[PDB]
Ligand binder design. Sequence first.
Ligand SMILES: [Mg+2]
Ligand SMILES: [Zn+2]
Lengths: 81, 23, 62, 717, 225, 224, 687
Amino acid sequence: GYDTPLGITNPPIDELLDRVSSKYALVIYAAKRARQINDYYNQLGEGILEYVGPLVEPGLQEKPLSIALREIHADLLEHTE
Amino acid sequence: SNNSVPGAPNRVSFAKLREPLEV
Amino acid sequence: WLSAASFQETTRVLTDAAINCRSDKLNGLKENVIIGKLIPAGTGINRYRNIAVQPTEEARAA
Amino acid sequence: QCGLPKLMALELFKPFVMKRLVDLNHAQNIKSAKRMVERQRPQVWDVLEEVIAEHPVLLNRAPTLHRLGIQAFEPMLVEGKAIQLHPLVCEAFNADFDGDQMAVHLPLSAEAQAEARILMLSSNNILSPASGRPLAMPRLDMVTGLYYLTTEVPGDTGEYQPASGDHPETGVYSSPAEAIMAADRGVLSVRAKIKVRLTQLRPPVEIEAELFGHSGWQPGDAWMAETTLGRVMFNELLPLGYPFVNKQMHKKVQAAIINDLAERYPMIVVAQTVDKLKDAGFYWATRSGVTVSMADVLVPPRKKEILDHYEERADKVEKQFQRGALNHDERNEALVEIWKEATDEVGQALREHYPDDNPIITIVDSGATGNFTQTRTLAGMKGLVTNPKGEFIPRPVKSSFREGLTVLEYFINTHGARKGLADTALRTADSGYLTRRLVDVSQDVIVREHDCQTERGIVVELAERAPDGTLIRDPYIETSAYARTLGTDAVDEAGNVIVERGQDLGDPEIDALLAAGITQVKVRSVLTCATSTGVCATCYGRSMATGKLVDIGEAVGIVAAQSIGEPGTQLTGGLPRVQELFEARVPRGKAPIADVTGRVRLEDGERFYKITIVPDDGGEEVVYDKISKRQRLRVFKHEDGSERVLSDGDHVEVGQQLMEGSADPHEVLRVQGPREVQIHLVREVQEVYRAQGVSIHDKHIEVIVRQMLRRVTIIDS
Amino acid sequence: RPTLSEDVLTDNRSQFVIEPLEPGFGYTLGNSLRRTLLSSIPGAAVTSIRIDGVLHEFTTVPGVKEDVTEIILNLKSLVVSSEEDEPVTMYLRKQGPGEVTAGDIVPPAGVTVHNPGMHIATLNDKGKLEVELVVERGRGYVPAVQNRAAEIGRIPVDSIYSPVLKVTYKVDATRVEQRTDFDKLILDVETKNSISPRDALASAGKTLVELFGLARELNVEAEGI
Amino acid sequence: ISQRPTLSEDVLTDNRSQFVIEPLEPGFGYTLGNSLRRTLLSSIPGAAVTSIRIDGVLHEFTTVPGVKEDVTEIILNLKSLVVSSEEDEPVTMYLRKQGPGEVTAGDIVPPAGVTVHNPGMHIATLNDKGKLEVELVVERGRGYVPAVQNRASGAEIGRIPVDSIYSPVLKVTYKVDATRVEQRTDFDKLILDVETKNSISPRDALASAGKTLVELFGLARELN
Amino acid sequence: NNPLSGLTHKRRLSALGPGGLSRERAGLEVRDVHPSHYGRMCPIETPEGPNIGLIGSLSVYARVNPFGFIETPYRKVVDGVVSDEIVYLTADEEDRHVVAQANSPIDADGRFVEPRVLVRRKAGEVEYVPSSEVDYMDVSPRQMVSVATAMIPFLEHDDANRALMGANMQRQAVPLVRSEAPLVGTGMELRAAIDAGDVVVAEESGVIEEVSADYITVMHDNGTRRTYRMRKFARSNHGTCANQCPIVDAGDRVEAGQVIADGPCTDDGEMALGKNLLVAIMPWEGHNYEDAIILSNRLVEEDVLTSIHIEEHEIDARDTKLGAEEITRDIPNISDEVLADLDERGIVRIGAEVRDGDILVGKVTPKGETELTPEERLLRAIFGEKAREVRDTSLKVPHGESGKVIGIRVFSREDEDELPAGVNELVRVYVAQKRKISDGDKLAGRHGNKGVIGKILPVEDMPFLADGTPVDIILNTHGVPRRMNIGQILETHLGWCAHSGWKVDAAKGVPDWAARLPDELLEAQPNAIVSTPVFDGAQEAELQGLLSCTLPNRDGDVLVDADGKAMLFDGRSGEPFPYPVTVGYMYIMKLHHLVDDKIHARSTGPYSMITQQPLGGKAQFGGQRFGEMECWAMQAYGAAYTLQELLTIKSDDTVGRVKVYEAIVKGENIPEPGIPESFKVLLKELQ
DNA sequence: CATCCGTGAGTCCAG
Ligand SMILES: [Mg+2]
Ligand SMILES: [Zn+2]
């Protein structure tokens, strides 16, 4: 129970940490998906077989990181160490 | 007055009288 | 010797290392920073470095 | 957030802006896109506003003493050429605004930004990794602002009045919205004690049970309170779900609240809460009427009276030395005491003569900033001044600064002040060098495992035993026990266990072990837990920053180094002692220890001290030779009386420090063994930082010490 | 550019957003509008009351759970619209076991109670209750000492005439064109069950237009929107 | 517990005027007069100089032969110049004087619909053999507009852009008499004070302030 | 930076230098204040850094004797009687004698008042001594201080730490567009300006024959005429503006030694390091938090805190192996839109405005005849444009710089101007900036009260007095009693008295508090100047009294009380502040640390020659340093990638930083970092 | 336990 997170505080990190072993893990877990998303957009223009696109609705001009970090909150990604 | 020597604007000074020697 | 020479008394560190033919295994913080590898700590350890992320099977293109 | 100047950002995201320039066809290629940014065409100010969207940057402020010297922020474009900084992170960077500069670094790679927003963001690193205390808290204006409204002013207007005569009860309001419209008309004071019915704030834990039976308070449930309107507006920030606090907000109070919020409530609640507190403090620091005038700074009434009393006592001492009845070393040693006593009496004169309205006093006694010794020097008197030697000058400075100091007073004052500045310069150079040695000795120390599993740990004294009865909290509790994890079940007198093994010690769990009567717990330490390379997670316990178990891979070795060398500037043993220990030198003191335990045989001579020890268990007499300049240490004997100095016939344990000074740890090794010498070091190290008011958790010290014993010598090949 | 008007809702209260104001006008409009809603809107409230079984205040009314204090407070939160300026009088009598509400109130002509579900006092068996209420009209907030004057148990009550309960406002900056100087005015307004916030603002908005008319009447020289 | 429509009295002086307004709500006067003071100082329209041009001068930082003052101090003297213009579009004044003597704001030649309200204003002390030919451009606006904006437009290398302080308001304040007597006689009596620059009247200033505010509060009455 | 700064430089006493000692060799004894330093070397003036105690300023009255020691003037006392005969004593000579303090009460003839007086003795020891034994006494109270020290009003009310900064900052003051003398002074402000040499003094008495902005001509009595030329808009060493303006009007009778034309930071011949600002000592909405400062927009609109800055840009044409560089208006592949502000030669025109990146001096050099790109050869056949052999080597405006072109200075080898061997044409272009004050700019008082400008509010947002006047500067209250520099308080009180004026009540006699007060001060005009000489001047008694004598404003109303406080209306809310706020006038200097110089940033740029790391500095368009201390913080975070990235692709990875730029503008992902080129250098250095 | 030589002795900034 809190006030609506604004800007870079969203998604709330506390619920983001609950879905991952440690802080450090969450980083690579997120950035590697951000690479998949930014690959998908450049590859799609000229190449098939790209990594699956954004599993959530992208915000207008939303950064690849900010998309990834949202679907981590949506439990739509699988986690492997 | 403090330094009544050149032709300067008068700046009134709280003072004990200082007449030993000019700077 | 890399972590030692980059500390103090460098001229003494080298002379001794070159005599004993000491081989440095680049497995340390100071060692890695120099050569420009990923440091053996934090998000640089293999436990967190080699991660595979995939969409849940339930998640599918519309 | 931070304020990133529009000119700065355009150069930082220069190849990023050119990208979107050729995207939205403002430029035909990448060569032209470059010329649009360089010429600063009006288009780019729209493009740039999109580029920096939630793309974090780093703020660095030299000297980077600890890891909070670099923090991540969400950049916000701003007119002007100056970096804008959130008031709370000033404590982290140790940054004021007298012309400070900061370095900005822009993360590029996908991982770098991830590490920035997650690891290094400012709203995540609220706590000092040294003590676990809140650094991002109300500090200057904020504390004085909050301390204002939460103060209970007795006879202020609008105060609650009981009913008597023909007039009923005055001072009772139906709602906060009613009391709000009251002070607007001008009937109620925001600091006057009243009674109000509240509908959106959980009552105290002690009152919630009385009114609900812990039926579970609910947003809508009503209850009556006896506070001030100000204290209500303050609790609307904590916000709901947090038990009401009816006190005045001294800094120690606010420190506790945030610390409690740190434990229970999630991070994003704390970051959002501490933001609310900031806004409040500044708005109320404005209307707090905290002002400095020549009027508010008042010289004591008994000023000349008090000084004449001691000057008379002084002249007596002067005449008593004039007849040569006093030694020259005794004369000044007495003159020092006389004026030391005088200055105190002048300070006492201030506090009582000063109203708690007085802004100079208001700031001081509210934990906002400043000491009363400064106030004493300001309106009372400077006091004694230090000699080139460091001894206190027999002559005092009777003048306060408000009265203006005399000429020759200013001179000797100046002398000291500069030497202070001189030493302040030289210690920093040392402190920094000590820091870098520490960093290097503990770099390969990383958390590599989750648990060593060894049952080995070390005892910690929870509390002293009161002579009359009951228990007394130990003074080392917070820095030696609070963060540890247990390595053995802690049981009371009964068979009932209080806290299990593998359980993190928290604030209540200490109370559980404090009330149960148990005064000693075995806990896991970095010293004991043996692992291949570096240390385990479990042993290390609660990472002071996270408030939870340290993650696997934390560079605890470097953070420990930082946490010790960061405050190493504020010392007088002193900083040399801290070196002397860490460099394992054969000490200056060279205080001997007992090779074997037994009965003490004091046989003092005037030319030389000699101590013999008759072995408790058979054995042969062991005898030492000591110089009369040192003196016997007042050791806590079996008699439970520490103040008992060494006497013949006393009983000493093995390795017991015989005289004052310091023990050579090398002897402690051969005498008491590897484990004992590690605990001597850590506490002897701690005693230096204790004396100057610095609090480092024993954790960090142990990381360094552990690395001092990893090697054994070769006796036979 | 001409300024816009927006609204985020709730049943009893709502937030209003004004932008883009010419730089420095957020604070020029802020506090001025707040004190208007809290004081410059007329309504109807309770000036004084009278209880049958009371000769002094400390003893609670025979047969009632609540003290004398809590009932007054309960009555302060009673919302009422009287049609005539002159002071009217309503009666509320009830006996036996149960709970007395605002729906039990017997209102005069042209006088309406808007929250008949409001809790007032819990009566037990053999519990008698007879109360005389005095309803006047006015604006804002008036203390109890000013209503201290039948002296056979007359009780002065805090008069909350105003239909607006509580108002707060913040001024942030909107970035119009290249200028990040322009002000954005956020305004939170909570009203009674008597009038809607959206309406309370218009009246508070219309009221203030009348004041600035006096100045404007003289020349109506220059301004641009 | 009383209702009375409010008034707006006036007690005058040549350059400044006190406006009296009563009877107002209790504790309402303070936050009302301020709502006016903040309007006057900031958003009252007027007119002033935007750019100039001098014979033999190419930039702000130099000296005309035979003139005691330098261009910077001259431009700094011209800031005090009080001007009113009716022409909504830019206009051009003139000033030419030679030989010994002192040039003033009087020697300026304002075209149709431009009036100088302070001719005694000292500009430059022209010594013998000193000649001064200037050329001043006046516009209409409000508040304060920095010189720096004029240069990038396309202005030739002759012109020297000068800051513009259009606000014809000088000094404004207020005081309030609140009758706090325990009765229904509780009200606030406002006394507003307005001083101008003799470019417009203290009354005409309060008129343009009100016309502005009304158009702002009118959007609080329009329906959704 | 300013006149005073130059003066202080000529009087600095250093231990550093050949034959002297090093900074590391100097222990803690050489630096601290010695007893002999009295009246010879100032105990306040010294640097704050690692140089502390090793650098000082010569005291005011002292002089140097033919043997290289420091003498100082003392008044001679024959037998309890002060004599006007003055003798200079060396340090060890003074030790053999016994000196009385300056302020010891003296008979109108010259005798002492009390038998036992305050006495200075060898080894810095002090004691009371009967008047029979007094040999000498001090010349003046302010004898111990330097020239910079003496200008700190109520100096004895500020601790040695802030007083030190107070003296070390006065040197750092920037000359303003026009300058005011301070309302509160110490008297030193006159002699300092004159001796500095950045004013214009009249050598021989006479009458002003002709005056211009350009020069002043004085007709002596004997018939001869001396003319003084005015320095106008000249660049100082530090880019500040030394601009002199005549004081006297034509025909004025002027006597010798009088100031006839002052320079920068000078008002009628007095040192004017700043402006007189209306202050308000109150916290205000957290914008003045932690020594930040709040300004009135008045200071922007009225150029109260505005200054000029002149830069000197330079470039030359040399003989090369491929020919010779020629400065011409014809630069390859440049429109006539950019060359617009050039003349036929290729130089910028006087009066033109210049922005960063714009052309100042168009120079071209012959480029080496190396085989042009086969891909560019092809591109030159299509458009049929033959390549020129001349590369653009023009002088463009450095990033950040901007302003009007206020002068060109051309030297040609052709026009016989003697140039160094190899050069032909050399051009200097001087550009000036009229920098208004802005956020981040460092302001300071004389009492070591520094700070940068936090927020500049509109003039209507300012907490104002009863008569409508909005204050100028809003200093925070918190940062006053901690620094022990309450001189700024006394300066403010006396500052209000000096602005409103005052009048002591003579009815029923002259009051007992203002009994010691000199007659001339018993009545004062609005905007009157006064002197509070250090270790003399105003006392807290006379100051409190003067607060009561404060004259009403133009509306016949007193504004501040006897406490020195006054009531303020919040310009935002309108409601008057609940408590009395200390209000008055305080002297503030604009220091030479302005954001327009301090700001810098870099995407990519030049790189080191050996280590291939980015160069360092704003002058080289360098990058920041992520030092050894800064690495530890990254490691302590666990940010392995961020740390690696900075030390690799962001730095000396030759192929990395190139392929990072490509990846960004093409909107791809960042590639994996390679090997640091610097590390490769090490392995070769070892080999 | 005390001498002689070699090696340590804060950061960033500007310049
Ligand atoms: Mg600082
Ligand atoms: Zn372990």
